[PDB]
Amino acid sequence: DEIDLYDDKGKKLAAGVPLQNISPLKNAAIKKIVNLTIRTGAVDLAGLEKKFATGAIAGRGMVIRGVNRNLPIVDKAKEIAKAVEDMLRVESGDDTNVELIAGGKRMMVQPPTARILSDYSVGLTASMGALTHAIIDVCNVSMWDAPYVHAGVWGMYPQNPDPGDGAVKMLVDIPMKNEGPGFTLRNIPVNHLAATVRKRAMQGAGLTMILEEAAQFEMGNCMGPHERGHLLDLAYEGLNANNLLYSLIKDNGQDGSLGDVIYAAVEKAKADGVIKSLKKMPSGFTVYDADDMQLWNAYACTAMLAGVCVNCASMRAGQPVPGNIMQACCLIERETGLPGPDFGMAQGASVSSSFFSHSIYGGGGPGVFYGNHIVTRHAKGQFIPCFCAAMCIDADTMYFSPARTSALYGEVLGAIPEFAEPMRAVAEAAK
């Protein structure tokens, strides 16, 4: 199998790319994106400083009277940043990195790959361990006061298994909150991803599908012949293989409806020989079959994402995506008599997410979902990239937007070249 890779403007990036070259297991760009995703922390030092000064060093709605200390962490930001960097370093010239941001109000921390022996959550712990000792040493905190520093940095942990109230913010979560073995890279909010690609839809879809598919491998879903179907989905839906994705959007973006995209995709599938007549029914309706079912699935998934982009961008809003994915799947099946994206699983997740974005029971708008979420985890990688796309496209119509929930990620992770331009990163490495 071979594909050409294209960018978000319909311009070709690489040709005659063997399908294996974009595999999460082999592509150096993907491997790098994964590595950065588990290593990179963001810290709001100004907010942390304020935590210590007010005694707001615990969880939501908590305040401890009498333990207010004034620790000039923003003032001494440069010393803190260097202490941390030196602690994180295992050997000179290694991939350890620490950068101050916004006049030292904020900080990026990247422990070196070598500190991760078995547990990806070292990216969090090394930083948290380094930061709290850094503060204590640099600001000359006494024994008596040391525990307040622990609380400021580690939050309610270990009393709460979740150190989420602490200072170091990752894209990923602690291992316990993962819904299964191999779900690590799925536990990343859509709003964080949307913020990270700075609200550019195709980059968001691409980045999100790169992470989803890598997770799919890690979950054990890509063994033997099962692999091919995932790599095709990734290439076509995620990486705009042979310009199918961009083409569908461009051709229908002016006055096209969701259905228009779907039908244009069926017609392209036919033209390309992906699907062909199996049987003509009494009404004249033709049921189609596909010699290469996995390839059809790739075409369908691309149709799905393109349909989402067209409709959501028309509304300049994110909320439509679940109902968009549903009718994308349903309609493509009714048009052809073939099975929809991920053999019904995508439609399934579109039903639950439709429900849990319009009801009292849970969920929220699309930006609070993610691959690990019980509501949206069901499809085998093709589903959540549509959500990120939708929340990039959203013109802040929603209350829980990336601007509200994820500013920190936009600011700190936004300038990471592999995050900003994931498709070009992959295409380069696949050459």
Binding site: H226, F343, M345, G348, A349, V351, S354, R377
Partner: protein, 578 residues
């Protein structure tokens, strides 16, 4: 409808509505709201609210239809419990208003199974201590004093009031007939006696169980209901550990606290324990022995229908369904995972009015028809998509026609979600009866739901068909979290983890395949036996009858009340009545 009124919906429809069952028209707006018969509880509730408000320091208001949605512009209908003649008020099916439903789940939650053979093995290995039927008998006597909260070793211990914990005791069962004969019969849950059911001869069910269990000795221990209510399901295996621990020390003259005691702890809490269910991923964090981790097959095995009515696979379905609707939908989805008014009728639709009953008996009939009148014959080389599709389409047309042709039935099942649940259950039953196999029931489930959407132009609620669209794919998948045998699924199987109107039916399908297959259990021989225990408060052999008694406040078997130790109730003033 089905030819036999004992299983069809015609008596229920006749007795619910003034018009004929096939009537297409009725009358609205003339019932006086809750002035009508079916408003009786709501009028009761209004009278009570006033007292509640009077008792509050700032007169914070409570129940008030005028502050919400007043009820009864349409007929407020009663319901008939499936395969009974018991009518009930709708309001009386809410789990909060129904002590029988509460007891049914508390009974399940407070149970733990624990092998004894390893403990004997440990006694032998480390101490060379003799174990005989007599010492086992003494052990069980001590355990039945200890388990509810009685002291066996220390001086100056406080103890529990027996009438507060009178539902707690322990029995043993075993495939070893000679051991059972030798032990004091007061402590025995007798398999030959509870499973004399057979198909071609007496005791075949017992035979199956004793062969599966073998010459092993197993304990079923029930903890006090009040313990389930004060705490959670995670207490249960731990409580067994503690009291079995204390019993061992006494019955075998050990040091009260030596290294052997430590190994007995691990034996009891880990090595030989069998729980109702395991914990949950932390988003829906829960202790052990809660509904979230309980497989469908265990739900089914907890009913007695197959031992009491061995030739009636659909009664087995419908009794398992009644337990499952209440447990998974009313309590788990409707409370543990949400709360409020909740999901009473999403559940009760599957155990009232003989509607699901009607579909499933018709389903079995159709499936047998296609199986050439030989139940469970469609297996191996006879099992293919053609015959399945024929069966499913036939029964789906049957069931969906009922709702359309007898509009009282649709009016009772007013939400599409329960119509879907029930039509699909009917299709599954048809396949269960033809095949004696659970997995293909999933193929019927998928096609029924897809056929439903296609026929009617609608299905269930906003997020009803998540698992349904996943069903075909998950059918025979072997991927990580995507596949697994039907019997072993439950509400932690990912696409099953959020929605009402499925788990009820599934509990039925899993039971039907197996009863049709002449199997004495679905998933667990151990739990099958344990739940046969006739000293349990709730009657696991007549589920819908129990629900009916709870509804009409005639139920006498609730445990764990505290009336014996209080002088009054919150919000209710003491003093004699005038």
């Amino acid at each position: 409808p089905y030819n036999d009124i004992q299983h069809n919906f015609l008596k229920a429809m006749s007795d619910k509505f003034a018009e004929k069952p096939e009537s297409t028209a009725t009358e609205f707006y003339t019932y006086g709201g809750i002035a009508q018969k079916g408003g009786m509880r709501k009028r009761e509730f209004i009278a009570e609210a006033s007292k509640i408000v009077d008792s509050r320091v700032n007169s914070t208001p409570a129940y008030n239809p005028d502050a919400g949605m007043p009820q009864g512009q349409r007929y407020l209908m009663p319901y008939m419990m499936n395969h009974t003649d018991i009518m009930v008020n709708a309001d009386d099916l809410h789990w909060i208003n129904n002590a029988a439903m509460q007891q049914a789940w508390d009974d399940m939650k407070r149970g733990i199974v624990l092998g004894l053979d390893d403990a004997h093995g440990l006694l032998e290995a480390r101490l060379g201590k003799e174990v005989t039927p007599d010492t086992i008998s003494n052990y069980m006597e001590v355990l039945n004093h200890a388990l509810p909260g009685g002291a066996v070793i220390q001086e100056h211990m406080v103890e529990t009031k027996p009438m507060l914990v009178n539902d707690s005791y322990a029995k043993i069962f075993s495939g070893d007939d000679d051991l059972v004969d030798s032990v004091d019969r007061r402590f025995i849950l007798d398999i030959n006696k509870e499973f004399a059911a057979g198909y071609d001869k007496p005791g075949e069910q017992a035979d199956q169980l004793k062969d599966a269990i073998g010459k092993k000795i197993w304990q079923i221990l029930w903890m006090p209901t009040v313990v389930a209510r004060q705490t959670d399901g995670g207490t249960m295996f731990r409580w067994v550990g503690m009291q079995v621990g204390m019993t061992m020390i006494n019955a075998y003259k050990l040091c009260a606290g030596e290294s052997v005691t430590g190994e007995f702890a691990y034996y009891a809490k880990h090595a030989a324990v069998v729980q109702l269910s395991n914990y949950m991923p932390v988003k829906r964090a829960r202790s052990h022995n809660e509904p979230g981790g309980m497989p469908l097959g265990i739900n089914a095995d907890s009913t007695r229908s197959p031992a009491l009515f061995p030739n009636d696979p659909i009664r087995a379905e419908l009794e398992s369904i009644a337990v499952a609707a209440m447990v998974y939908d009313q309590l788990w989805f409707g409370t543990y995972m949400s709360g409020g008014v909740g999901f009473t009728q999403y559940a009760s639709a599957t155990y009232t009015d003989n509607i699901l009953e009607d579909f499933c008996y018709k389903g079995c009939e159709i499936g047998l028809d296609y199986a050439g009148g030989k139940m469970a014959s469609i297996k191996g080389d006879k099992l293919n998509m053609d015959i399945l599709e024929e069966i499913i389409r036939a029964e789906n047309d049957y069931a969906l026609t009922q709702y359309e042709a007898y509009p009282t039935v649709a009016e009772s099942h007013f939400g599409g979600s329960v119509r879907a649940c029930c039509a699909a259950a009917g299709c599954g039953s048809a396949v269960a009866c033809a095949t004696g196999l659970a997995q293909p029931a999933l193929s019927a489930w998928s096609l029924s739901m897809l056929g439903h959407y296609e026929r009617v132009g609608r299905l269930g609620f906003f997020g009803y068909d998540l698992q349904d669209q996943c069903t075909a794919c998950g059918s025979y998948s072997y991927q990580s979290d995507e596949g697994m045998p039907f019997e072993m699924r439950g509400v932690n199987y990912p696409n099953y983890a959020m929605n009402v109107g499925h788990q009820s039916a599934y509990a039925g399908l899993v039971a039907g395949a197996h009863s049709a297959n002449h199997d004495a259990w679905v998933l667990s021989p151990l739990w099958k036996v344990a739940f046969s225990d006739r000293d349990l408060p709730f009657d696991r052999g007549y589920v819908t009858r129990e629900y009916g008694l709870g509804a009409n406040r005639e139920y006498t078997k609730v445990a764990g009340e505290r009336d014996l130790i209080i002088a009054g109730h919150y919000g209710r003033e003491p003093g004699a009545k005038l």
